[PDB]
Design a protein around this ligand. Structure first.
Ligand SMILES: CCN1CCN(Cc2ccc(Nc3ncc(F)c(-c4cc(F)c5nc(C)n(C(C)C)c5c4)n3)nc2)CC1
Length: 263
């Protein structure tokens, strides 16, 4: 074969991800993702190859596709989880947070402008390169609920703002070094969210969902500087715009790129 698996990176309800030696290309490490056995899949692979033509710096490179399905990506040594675990006290430098967030938002805007929704954005699939570059992985192909948007939890809408809620959760965690909303179920996750942001207006609550606004009594919105210590005034404004309950009122990745926090 053209590839030689040397270690396992991950396993789950997708298949397995292996760290492999790319024999033909000077023995460089690559990440091979193996998938199961359609037509919606043919189309998803076509979008992946098309996104690769842009070679965006803030998404993992796709080097090959094999015929069950093998996806060959550029290998990157660590994820954001291991990065946050190893960073010395008192934490991630203030400008390292800003730079990683800008790159996260560039990769996300690239994906959103090409009508790809990530849907499972978390530190586990945000990869940190040897030179400190952010690269997005595990997207374009169809478990922790800590980064799930309220509209996904409520099962109402699944548009691009879903990823901006996840970004807000990641932004807060870059400061905290611990997840912001650590719920044990969809109902618990929603409860934990509203204990912080507060209850939205009855007209910001989606109609025809199973969970009504009355199922929660999470009274007032608590100040965010309590849960996210050391965040500046600008970072706080951007954090709140990502963590807006109504997805139609939530900031997009494109406007986030223009926010004064990145000046
Ligand atoms: C059990 C924990 N230990 C210690 C911590 N360690 C973290 C870690 C995470 C990622 C990498 N490397 C890497 N490089 C390039 C890639 F493109 C992918 C990649 C591609 C995909 F398509 C994926 N799809 C899914 C679902 N994942 C998951 C596997 C995250 C994908 C990952 N991964 N190296 C280390 C994992 C093993």
């Amino acid at each position: 074969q053209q590839y030689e698996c040397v270690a396992e990176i991950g396993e789950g309800a997708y298949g397995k991800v292996f760290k492999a030696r790319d024999l033909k290309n000077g023995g460089r490490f690559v990440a091979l993702k193996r998938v199961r056995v359609p037509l919606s899949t043919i189309r998803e692979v076509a979008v992946l190859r098309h996104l690769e033509t842009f070679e965006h710096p803030n998404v993992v490179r796709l080097f090959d596709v094999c015929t069950k399905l093998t996806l060959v990506f550029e290998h990157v040594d660590q994820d954001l989880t291991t990065y946050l675990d190893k960073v010395p006290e008192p934490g991630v430098p203030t400008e390292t947070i800003k730079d990683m967030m800008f790159q996260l938002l560039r990769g996300l805007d690239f994906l959103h402008s090409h009508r790809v929704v990530h849907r499972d954005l978390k530190p586990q699939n945000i990869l940190v390169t040897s030179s400190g570059q952010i690269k997005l992985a595990d997207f374009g192909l169809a478990v922790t609920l800590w980064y799930r948007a309220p509209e996904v939890l409520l099962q109402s809408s699944y548009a691009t703002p879903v990823d901006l809620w996840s970004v807000g959760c990641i932004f807060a965690e870059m400061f905290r070094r611990k997840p912001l909303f650590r719920g044990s179920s969809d109902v618990d996750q929603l409860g934990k969210i509203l204990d912080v942001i507060g209850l939205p207006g009855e007209e910001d609550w989606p109609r025809d969902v199973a969970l009504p606004r009355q199922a929660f009594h999470s009274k007032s919105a608590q100040p965010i500087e309590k849960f996210v210590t050391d965040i500046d005034e600008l970072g706080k404004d951007l954090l709140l715009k990502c963590l807006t309950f109504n997805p139609a009122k939530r900031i997009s990745a494109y406007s986030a790129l223009s926010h004064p926090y990145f000046q």
